[PDB]
Amino acid sequence: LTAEEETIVKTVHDFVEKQVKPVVRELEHANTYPEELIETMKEIGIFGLAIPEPYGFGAVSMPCYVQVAEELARGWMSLAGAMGGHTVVSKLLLLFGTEEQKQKYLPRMATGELRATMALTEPGGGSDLQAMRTVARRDGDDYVINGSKTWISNARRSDLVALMCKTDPDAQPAHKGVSILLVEKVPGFDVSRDLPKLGYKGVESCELNFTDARVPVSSLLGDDEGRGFAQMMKGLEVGRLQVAARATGVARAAFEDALRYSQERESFGKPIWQHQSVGNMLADMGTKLYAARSLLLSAAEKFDAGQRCDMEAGMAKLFASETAMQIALDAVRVHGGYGYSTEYDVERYFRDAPLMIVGEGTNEIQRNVIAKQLVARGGLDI
Amino acid sequence: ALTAEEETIVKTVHDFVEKQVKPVVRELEHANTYPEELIETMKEIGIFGLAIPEPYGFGAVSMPCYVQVAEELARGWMSLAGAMGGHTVVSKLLLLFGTEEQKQKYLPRMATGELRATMALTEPGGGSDLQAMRTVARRDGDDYVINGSKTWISNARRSDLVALMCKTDPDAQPAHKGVSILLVEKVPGFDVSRDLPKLGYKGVESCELNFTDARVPVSSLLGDDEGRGFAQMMKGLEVGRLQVAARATGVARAAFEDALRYSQERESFGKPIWQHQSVGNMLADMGTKLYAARSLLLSAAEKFDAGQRCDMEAGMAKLFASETAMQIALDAVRVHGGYGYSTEYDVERYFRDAPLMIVGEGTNEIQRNVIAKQLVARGGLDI
Amino acid sequence: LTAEEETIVKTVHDFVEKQVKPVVRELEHANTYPEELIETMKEIGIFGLAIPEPYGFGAVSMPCYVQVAEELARGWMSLAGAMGGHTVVSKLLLLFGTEEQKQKYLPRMATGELRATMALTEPGGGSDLQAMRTVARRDGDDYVINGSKTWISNARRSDLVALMCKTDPDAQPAHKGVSILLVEKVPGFDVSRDLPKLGYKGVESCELNFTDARVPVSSLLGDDEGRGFAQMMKGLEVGRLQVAARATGVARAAFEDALRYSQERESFGKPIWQHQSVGNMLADMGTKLYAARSLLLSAAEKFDAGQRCDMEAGMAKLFASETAMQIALDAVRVHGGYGYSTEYDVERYFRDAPLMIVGEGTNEIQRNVIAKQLVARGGLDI
Amino acid sequence: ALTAEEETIVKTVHDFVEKQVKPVVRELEHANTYPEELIETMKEIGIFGLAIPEPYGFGAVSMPCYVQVAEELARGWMSLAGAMGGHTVVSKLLLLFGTEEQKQKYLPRMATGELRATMALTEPGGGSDLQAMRTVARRDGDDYVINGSKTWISNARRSDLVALMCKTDPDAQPAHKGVSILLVEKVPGFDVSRDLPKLGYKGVESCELNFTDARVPVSSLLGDDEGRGFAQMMKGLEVGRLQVAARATGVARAAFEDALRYSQERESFGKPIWQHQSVGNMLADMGTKLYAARSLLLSAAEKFDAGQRCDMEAGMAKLFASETAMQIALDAVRVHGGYGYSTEYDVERYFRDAPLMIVGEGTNEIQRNVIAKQLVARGGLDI
Ligand SMILES: Cc1cc2c(cc1C)N(C[C@H](O)[C@H](O)[C@H](O)COP(=O)(O)OP(=O)(O)OC[C@H]1O[C@@H](n3cnc4c(N)ncnc43)[C@H](O)[C@@H]1O)c1[nH]c(=O)[nH]c(=O)c1N2
Ligand SMILES: Cc1cc2c(cc1C)N(C[C@H](O)[C@H](O)[C@H](O)COP(=O)(O)OP(=O)(O)OC[C@H]1O[C@@H](n3cnc4c(N)ncnc43)[C@H](O)[C@@H]1O)c1[nH]c(=O)[nH]c(=O)c1N2
Ligand SMILES: Cc1cc2c(cc1C)N(C[C@H](O)[C@H](O)[C@H](O)COP(=O)(O)OP(=O)(O)OC[C@H]1O[C@@H](n3cnc4c(N)ncnc43)[C@H](O)[C@@H]1O)c1[nH]c(=O)[nH]c(=O)c1N2
Ligand SMILES: Cc1cc2c(cc1C)N(C[C@H](O)[C@H](O)[C@H](O)COP(=O)(O)OP(=O)(O)OC[C@H]1O[C@@H](n3cnc4c(N)ncnc43)[C@H](O)[C@@H]1O)c1[nH]c(=O)[nH]c(=O)c1N2
């Protein structure tokens, strides 16, 4: 990384060590929205990491970005979650947005004055998006939106929502009917309920209801209707990389606590790491985490070099997310009974890890996508 | 075969779980509310007397029946099985090792649940390395004077008899011959100090205990001789490991049932999700492992009951079932997709409860050590 | 088990200890057909374990049967393989055969004078049997058979082959066109080639070619054409149980060698089992093997009690077969470098284990079948 | 970035594998035939001089290039990478620790393959517990007199220089300071006793060595001082672990390629088998793990080359890649169904070769022990 990029990663690490870690336990326990921490994140530039001049201060490299996201997640997964969707919307705007849209939204998004999130998932399905029921019917110079979404993260605090919806529910082929609309908080758009979650606490995830919600037709992302799927798929290069960084972040936290505790707790006359059963866990955890970060960093470099990286980003997400779950459980084992205590942090990492497996696209879907990609590519890029 | 009465008790407990436990468990468990009404119904059912024969109680069910009762309870809510586990182990220790006076003093009120008991072994400085324990009981006239501390003691507040493993001779040679078990009532100097906040196993309290100059009569000693605490506990761990294995198969049954049901209710891409191989494969693996774990458990319970050696088999049951329940709990979350993460669904609770049987009822690392040594002592499996 | 059944299991165990184990290494290495050992197996009654009076001495209980098969496999998997298909054909004859067929074949099968095997698999597919190309066209009082099978075990030494084939390739629905024929070694039926295998050595597995091979129409198993699938599916209750017993057998052998070696080999001043890394493997191996046998024995009892046991038999096969593979590799680990030497037996168990995973129906298919069964049943039988 | 010449060498080795190795490997490997022609072509290519710089040889490639060459070789046939592994490690030990005389005596003929070297550490009594080794070298005038035995020594017959770890002072205090490495030629008393029959790694011999009153000059000592054998070997194990990791990723690449190709050629139930999720999922998991393992390997190779600490990272690469190759090899067998079991297909060979990198190049149990200790010494990962 360049010195400027190294400095950014260090500022975030120091932010996590000095500001996040002292307060996270109490806030996460009470499901308190971390306003002060988020505000500091806006000040250091977290909400503009993908936004270049003239709209923002500059788009850091993807290797820098994943390190930032990892550092945040290592302190508290929810903080990285607070900017994940926002970064994806940023990227979608840059790739596909009109000049007017980019100009309208990107400058305030970069400071975090305006936050954005992604609304794809419907109550009837998050995987089978083609079956979605949310429609956007053209009426004069407006779309009239009727439907619902759920599990939408940061939905209350985000005043721009990238809504995947059916601009033509009767299109043939059906993919021509699906678009992305950039939807502000207009009448008829209700953020109807906060959903109670195992982990990812502090950040709200919500049901959305649209009852004849009118938005200008200029809300369309890009010039053409029916590009929503192709657009999303490109968005997922960044999405999958950030989720993977979230997972290596949670894994780092759990591994660090486990390794530290194994030196401080003794049994049968020695530090517990010197029992092979515990040392073996530490060796496996560290080795898999090194593999996971190595893969992540490799995928990020491919992204940065402008090479095809869609499969690689997916593999990063699959591997890191499964790895973080394994590491989290083993960190609990290393603490013995104290692993089960809410006065230690490992139980929280254990609660947080599944989010990246089931709640950021599923890993079953991710495997299906990787298999298709392997066949298309003919193997790994070696 | 289970006797008539034994089949009936299992059914009664299943019905209690379906009609009384399941409709209130979310609210109680989420609020960490002590389930006083549910536990009282368990007392009436006879749950606290399952190992207590006549003349003290209304009959000791077979071990295969006992594990099925524990499994049914845990299927509804792991914590309700936890409520009676240590009590059962103490019941057994009294029968195996107690004087006639002790058995008569405690077992009749234990069988009804009027008196509850728990086991206190774990110290803040270690639950595995018990030889290093600091709790001491020193003879002074016809009392023991107890000083020290224990922690993670389940049901310590609601239990008014505690089987306390402590050093009656800290200078013993060999050192393991200095450890005994005392049956300690709630005497002056015995403080039940605080409820420890936990990931799961909610509703049931686990506590730190502090003993300051706590006087009990020397008749509190379990058995006639000091220095047999470890031997006695080993024998108690046969019951303990089987009951923990049953907790784990019960939690597994609950997670698996929910996942299988959900996989038929939820559809994607035009069909019930079980018909996608990625999901159907998880169900097949879950169901297959669960069948393996219950088969192992029931085999070990029958060996216990046939009077055959079952110490290794009980540890195997605990190890296999607890690891299996954790695997099944996670996969049940996966089957639910995003809803697996919601506390309005039950699979997140099983996921939070499953690690308890792995790290908090003796650890699985210690359990493998014990099994390796037993395999060598035995020369392999009993075949 | 009854005393008679205990005695049978003991006779086989003693046969394995006294006769098999001294010679297996040299024979298996050279792919030598174990004629003497097979002949002894005929003499002790292995080929009539499922054949009742009046045709044979008696059908042992399924719990007895799985213990016999396990004992054989523990000495050498190939020996249990030599009687597996034969037992299934025995069972198919008893369940579905005419009185004439049963009388013709079962008495000689019970002594092993006549051996039988199952021929389902085609070169084009062993899983997708409905797509099979082998046809049996009626011409007068004969079927004329044209096609091919492959991976047919014991095909040279078996003079009766239960051939799944299409008696009506145009049937609608297509399952009405599939039958089982009991085919003797007639002209036009070539056992064309022996296939070289990783393990399962000593026993031949062959390609079969049928070129206008004529058999009497009385060769049909049962009175009706188009019952082949339903018949096979019933045959697989016994098939899956025997394969599961083969796996627990190989697992017992590998575990026993590993446990023994861990007491006899020392490093850093002590027997290697006392290193937790090795002890942990032994504990896991023993525990999983106990689970596997417990499940197997439970499924066998259900079979014997006449309760539905099809899912259970499949679960037994899946679990035991995966377990034996895991145990075999770990037995190799326990031996260190000597695990890799062909002068020790663990490499052979390692080569043999995959057979039960890929070569006795696949475990992927087995999982699909179990999922369907779980949905049909509504869960486990508890 | 790889230099021009470095990219070219990798391509040359890939082409050699595709055109020369693959068409003959089955017949040779099945017959345990020493691949003399293939190895001779490897000599001409420069394979035996990859770590030997000027003035001794035509240049030491970077470590990232080296691992890619080793991986390409192993992809074709694990045994061909094995043929040059120990030779590379000895090359490095000579460069790090040898006198000018030793370097000049051996490295020029080593670089061409005219002289081959191997490492002899493992004893019949143990390959892990090397401190317990029985091979001794006792000074007598200006000779060492060597007595003892080694086993599993790869390429012992074809290699005419053996780096022998032995006790120059069996009474040393501390005991580890009695162990040295001697560069031993094929002298009277040094018997290469027999080729050990193996599950895989065929074509290349592994042998028992027996030393009886075997005299070598004292100048055979690697370095100026006795008692540094363990320290020197640790340094050599950086190269050794990286090369073994590369063998494992190479074998994995071969198994994965075959499985992916087969999954497109074979159809069932109306489609290419990859389109059944059970198969596609295996491919996704295989490809994902392989990518992880190669990423880790290349990261560790770059650290080596940047002069950064890489001792833990090399062990991690070996552990992860070897376990990954075994998993991928089995799943490739599964993908082929029954044909996976046929010796007319190649996946059975990868399956037989993969355990070598787990149990026979230091064990993975020892490797985890080493990694745990390193993690503690370091305080975690280098991040
Ligand atoms: C909610 C709840 C409820 C209860 C309990 C726990 C919890 C969490 N337990 C306490 C429980 O039995 C205890 O946690 C375990 O004995 C493990 O103890 P430590 O936490 O001290 O692990 P400890 O500090 O011993 O071990 C930490 C880690 O090192 C490992 N380790 C330690 N020594 C080792 C060795 N020699 N070899 C290999 N690995 C080794 C452990 O396996 C673990 O991974 C208890 N107790 C009680 O007495 N009565 C009760 O009612 C309950 N109930
Ligand atoms: C806390 C939190 C936060 C968020 C989100 C979730 C959660 C829990 N998500 C929603 C998330 O992406 C969603 O849960 C997943 O897409 C999975 O969707 P379903 O729950 O609908 O699984 P679904 O019902 O699709 O699947 C259920 C199970 O079946 C499997 N399955 C389904 N179809 C299959 C197939 N064809 N093949 C194989 N297996 C198949 C799945 O893998 C899963 O195991 C979200 N969404 C969003 O739009 N914006 C957001 O901000 C967030 N944030
Ligand atoms: C084909 C082939 C080729 C070669 C070699 C092997 C093979 C099979 N090796 C030998 C190889 O390095 C050796 O096998 C390993 O060092 C393991 O040694 P043992 O077989 O003596 O295992 P050992 O007897 O040390 O161990 C047996 C089991 O116990 C475990 N164990 C032992 N001590 C332990 C501890 N303290 N803690 C935890 N677990 C422990 C091991 O991990 C293993 O599971 C070799 N050598 C050489 O010098 N030069 C060469 O060229 C080759 N090449
Ligand atoms: C040594 C030996 C001995 C015997 C046999 C094999 C071998 C190797 N078998 C044949 C064996 O039963 C056969 O190999 C299996 O049925 C698998 O068949 P294919 O190899 O055709 O796999 P196939 O080509 O069907 O499958 C290839 C891969 O795709 C997977 N797959 C295929 N369809 C799928 C689907 N719908 N969903 C998910 N995954 C799917 C498979 O699981 C496998 O991983 C046999 N047969 C016989 O009739 N008589 C005998 O005596 C013997 N004995």
Side-chain angles (χ1 to χ4, degrees), chain A residues 38-51:
Chain A
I38 296 276
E39 201 60 36
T40 301
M41 285 165 61
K42 296 184 185 190
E43 290 161 3
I44 51 195
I46 298 302
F47 289 87
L49 288 171
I51 302 176

Side-chain angles (χ1 to χ4, degrees), chain A residues 117-122 125-128 150-153 197 200 205 355 358-362 364-365 368, chain B residues 262 266-269 273 276 278-279 282 334-339 341, chain D residues 277:
Chain A
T117 185
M118 292 290 290
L120 315 189
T121 300
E122 306 242 327
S127 301
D128 187 2
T150 194
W151 286 121
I152 308 309
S153 295
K197 286 179 285 191
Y200 198 10
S205 296
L355 183 271
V358 304
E360 292 290 350
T362 71
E364 295 74 33
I365 295 305
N368 292 343
Chain B
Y262 191 74
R266 182 63 159 191
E267 302 198 3
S268 73
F269 301 87
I273 58 168
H276 305 305
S278 305
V279 178
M282 280 187 290
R334 294 176 189 276
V335 168
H336 283 76
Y339 301 98
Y341 211 62
Chain D
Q277 291 177 352

Side-chain angles (χ1 to χ4, degrees), chain A residues 70-71 252 255 259 262-263 273 276 279-280 282-284 286-295 298-299 302 312-313 315-316 318-319 364 366-368 370-372 374-375 378-382, chain D residues 71-72 253 256-257 260 263-264 274 277 280-281 283-285 287-296 299-300 303 313 316-317 319-320 365 367-369 371-373 375-376 379-383:
Chain A
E70 182 184 76
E71 291 294 336
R252 279 185 58 198
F255 176 63
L259 181 61
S262 80
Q263 298 163 76
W273 72 267
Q276 291 175 351
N280 289 354
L282 296 169
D284 280 342
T287 298
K288 294 185 302 192
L289 180 55
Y290 181 29
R293 298 194 75 254
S294 289
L295 193 177
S298 161
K302 279 171 186 285
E312 289 80 3
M315 289 180 161
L318 174 64
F319 193 80
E364 295 74 33
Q366 185 65 80
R367 283 197 189 87
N368 292 343
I370 290 163
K372 280 168 196 304
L374 290 161
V375 169
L380 298 182
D381 272 358
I382 292 169
Chain D
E71 177 186 80
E72 287 300 332
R253 278 176 62 195
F256 180 67
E257 287 171 22
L260 181 58
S263 81
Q264 293 165 80
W274 73 266
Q277 291 177 352
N281 291 350
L283 295 166
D285 283 343
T288 298
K289 293 189 306 198
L290 179 49
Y291 183 27
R294 298 188 77 254
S295 296
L296 195 176
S299 168
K303 285 176 195 301
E313 291 85 350
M316 289 181 161
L319 177 64
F320 191 79
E365 298 72 30
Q367 187 62 83
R368 292 197 176 81
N369 291 340
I371 288 164
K373 186 171 147 74
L375 285 162
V376 165
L381 297 184
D382 226 301
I383 298 181

Side-chain angles (χ1 to χ4, degrees), chain B residues 230-340:
Chain B
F230 284 120
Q232 294 166 342
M233 200 53 253
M234 262 180 69
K235 213 57 215 182
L237 292 169
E238 292 178 0
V239 177
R241 287 166 172 156
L242 289 170
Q243 65 97 349
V244 173
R247 268 190 245 170
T249 58
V251 172
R253 278 176 62 195
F256 180 67
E257 287 171 22
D258 285 1
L260 181 58
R261 172 177 51 66
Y262 191 74
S263 81
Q264 293 165 80
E265 292 171 343
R266 182 63 159 191
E267 302 198 3
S268 73
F269 301 87
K271 58 201 190 164
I273 58 168
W274 73 266
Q275 301 183 357
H276 305 305
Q277 291 177 352
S278 305
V279 178
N281 291 350
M282 280 187 290
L283 295 165
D285 283 343
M286 295 159 77
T288 298
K289 293 189 306 198
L290 179 49
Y291 183 27
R294 298 188 77 254
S295 296
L296 195 176
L297 173 64
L298 292 169
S299 168
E302 291 286 1
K303 285 176 195 301
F304 177 99
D305 231 50
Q308 283 154 16
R309 60 200 194 162
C310 63
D311 58 355
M312 180 180 84
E313 291 85 350
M316 289 181 161
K318 188 275 195 180
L319 177 64
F320 191 79
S322 66
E323 292 296 329
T324 291
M326 183 70 265
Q327 293 164 11
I328 291 174
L330 171 60
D331 283 349
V333 165
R334 294 176 189 276
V335 168
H336 283 76
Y339 301 98

Side-chain angles (χ1 to χ4, degrees), chain B residues 288, chain C residues 240-251 288-289 292-293 295-296 313-329 349-350 352-364 366-367 370, chain D residues 330 334:
Chain B
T288 298
Chain C
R240 282 160 180 163
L241 291 167
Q242 62 96 358
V243 172
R246 224 188 290 170
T248 60
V250 173
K288 294 185 302 192
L289 180 55
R293 298 194 75 254
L295 193 177
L296 174 60
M315 289 180 161
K317 187 267 178 175
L318 174 64
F319 193 80
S321 67
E322 296 295 329
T323 291
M325 187 65 258
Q326 292 163 8
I327 291 172
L329 172 58
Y349 314 138
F350 177 82
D352 279 352
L355 183 271
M356 286 77 91
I357 291 180
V358 304
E360 292 290 350
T362 71
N363 281 350
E364 295 74 33
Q366 185 65 80
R367 283 197 189 87
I370 290 163
Chain D
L330 171 60
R334 294 176 189 276

